[PDB]
Subunit: 340 residues, 2 copies
Amino acid sequence: TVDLDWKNLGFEYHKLPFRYISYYKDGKWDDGKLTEDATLHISESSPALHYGQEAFEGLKAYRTKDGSVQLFRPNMNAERLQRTADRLLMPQVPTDKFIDAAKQVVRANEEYVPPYGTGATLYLRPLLIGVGDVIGVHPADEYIFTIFAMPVGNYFKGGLAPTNFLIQDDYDRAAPHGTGAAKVGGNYAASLLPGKVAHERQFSDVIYLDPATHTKIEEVGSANFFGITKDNEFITPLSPSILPSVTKYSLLYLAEHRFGMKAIEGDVCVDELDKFVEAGACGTAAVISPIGGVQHGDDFHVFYSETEVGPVTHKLYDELTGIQFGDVKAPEGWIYKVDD
Amino acid sequence: TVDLDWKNLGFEYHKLPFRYISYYKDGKWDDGKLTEDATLHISESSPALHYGQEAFEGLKAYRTKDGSVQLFRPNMNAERLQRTADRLLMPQVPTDKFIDAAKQVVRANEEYVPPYGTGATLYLRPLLIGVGDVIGVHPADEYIFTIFAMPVGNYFKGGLAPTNFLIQDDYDRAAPHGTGAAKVGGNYAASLLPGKVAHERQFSDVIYLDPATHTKIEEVGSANFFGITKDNEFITPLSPSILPSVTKYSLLYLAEHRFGMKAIEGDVCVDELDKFVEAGACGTAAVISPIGGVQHGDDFHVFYSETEVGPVTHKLYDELTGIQFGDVKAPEGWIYKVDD
């Protein structure tokens, strides 16, 4: 481990010594290599730049109590990137290629994986882009797959803390039959302006509703929503317009198999918020972001507290992060040791 | 003029000797320069690549009968790019900067502006992208504005010809409150898969309906729809989810001021297609693409003919292209001579 202000990293870009890069040409991926060049050199006519033919992932490497480093369910990120690629007519990066590449980046930059137990991690950003020359709208025939990395902070140093979110019905991050279930730049571009709107009213982010009818919750910025009912059920939105987070599936799994809770993907109506005794957002970067209150029109709805975080949220957070950092026994197949 | 197969260019990328490029840093655009480098060198963490923070324009330079070259309403492209930038939180490229840059590119590559009268033109592709380093979703603070060029063919060598289009209701190119009215890559990425679907059924492209209700026509691929009624009215869809083409406004204008037609932006219901004696798509690349028939569910609706093109479409096409190539007197303020 080098000497960085580990606890006070936030979540931002750092230029680390090595990234992985692989080129797709003539219907094939090359084997990939590590490069020291953090600048991409791509045609002015690259479809990633003109026609949004781009996708990314996000996953973390965690240092454990004995010093060894591990990935958490990177097979799930690979499969999500494959579905995202299909939607945008990009060639898939196979799961074994993806996971191997991720490991190569962690190993090559292992001294940047923060010490146990800062709660800090090495964040990996895989990126898949259409390059080469295309002027009429059409998929590329050349692609780049790259994974670069940066250390990121806990974000909950001081413990879990609630923040407030805004439902703002005159913005959609995705269409009903658009690219919402694909991790692509286009969805994020649409979120820039509503994000700014939320921020200027002192909310963390916007909670988006279903684009067809605007009556059901879709997601919290780029993260998934979950609610806990009085009968200790875990409920998260299910829509074909929603990005399915690895964190959400993991929480679904742990809620059931560790806590004996009914854990389902169902619709969550904005008119039934009192159904939930606790609520939060979940995702790789976020882990769990407890929701204090949600603003919708005139109304400000507080699930549990504006200052404290609920017991069930606490329990799920402790168990998920424990597994990720290796302090709690993992479900079968979830942990991928970086030196294996 | 150099020696290229002018009539048989299609619409595709060519690497010409010079492009314009200008960088935005510290809240300011530089003055711009011409460069011979057709490769962009941008951070692996550029928001254009991760968060779809990108926009483009398209406009043509036309050689006239005396050999001089001119642009057609590039002020309109500049203003559209400004609105597109606002939507994606990118700094605006001022109209005078935009038009001057376009002229510099035409002049620097003037020998690639096809001869009169091939019907071929020099296509300009301005591109505005967020670059520099950003990992959490957020606008860039560094931007590139570049304009590169390529000669493109008539596409209607053989005269205007109708093609068929498909309405396919399980895809949206944009959300009701998304980025549809902004010329950004995200909209085009969403169109890749439905485009492929259309093409494999031997249709030119998809006609998209309004994403909320799917009862009104939005646009024809990336081009605008227009219909002509039996009472010689020109009607084109108006939605806040539609990209407003310069060609559409120009056709609206000419229909009224040259042909004495009522010319309006109104809704066009998919259940009232018999309202139209002729229909087409309009845009910079397309000019006018006459629509033969439209497939919707079981039904194939032919407005005028599957093989011939209607008289009113012909008249509008002749007048618009005449103005663009300088053979017909222009409305005030439309033509921008490249050496002025």
